[PDB]
Design a protein around this ligand. Structure first.
Ligand code: HEM
Length: 154
């Protein structure tokens, strides 16, 4: 799949708003993920003991992880589809070291869309959400293709 330039503009226009608060959006997204799909929190050894949302909000490790996730995703989106080199190391560690199924990448995609929609309604109407969903489906499809070359799931 290939996004048109107008779809990329819609994705990078709401992303520039996310980048005004990367740690705050990082937290929101990871907590939304962990609440919605609590099975995903077990993949995180450093903070799978967390029991409540208040403990998640106060964790400095969880916030730092959110910043890591969003900074890497932001570097991939800004490539506008030319992201082959950025995906390689990412696919390798999620498929071989952490073992994250594609399914979980779908779950965090859903968490991203949920939080942008709540925080940025004005910049995240139907067309901007359709373009963000297309940009995350492209990311997932490319990463699933790399998992397959690496010897993992699909
Ligand atoms: C937008 C999708 C995602 C991006 C861009 C992303 C990015 C990263 C990055 C940059 C790192 C640090 C370097 C590395 O280990 O490769 C990381 C580590 C990790 N990621 Fe992801 N990730 C994503 C989704 C997930 C999901 C959905 C899970 C699990 C449910 C997951 C679990 C982990 C784990 C366990 C680590 C290790 C954390 C620690 O250091 O102990 N990732 N991820």
């Amino acid at each position: 799949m290939v996004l048109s330039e107008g779809e990329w503009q819609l994705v990078l226009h709401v992303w520039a708003k996310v980048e005004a608060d990367v740690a705050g959006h990082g937290q929101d997204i990871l907590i939304r993920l962990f609440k919605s799909h609590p099975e995903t929190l077990e993949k995180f050894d450093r903070f799978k003991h967390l029991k409540t949302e208040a403990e998640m909000k106060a964790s400095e490790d969880l916030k730092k992880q959110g910043v890591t996730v969003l900074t890497a995703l932001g570097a991939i989106l800004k490539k506008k589809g030319h992201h082959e080199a950025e995906l390689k190391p990412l696919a390798q560690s999620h498929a071989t070291k952490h073992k994250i199924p594609i399914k979980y990448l779908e779950f965090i995609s859903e968490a991203i869309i949920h939080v942008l929609h709540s925080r940025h309604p004005g910049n995240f109407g139907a067309d901007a959400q359709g373009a963000m969903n297309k940009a995350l489906e492209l990311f997932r499809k490319d990463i699933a293709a790399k998992y397959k070359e690496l010897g993992y799931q699909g």
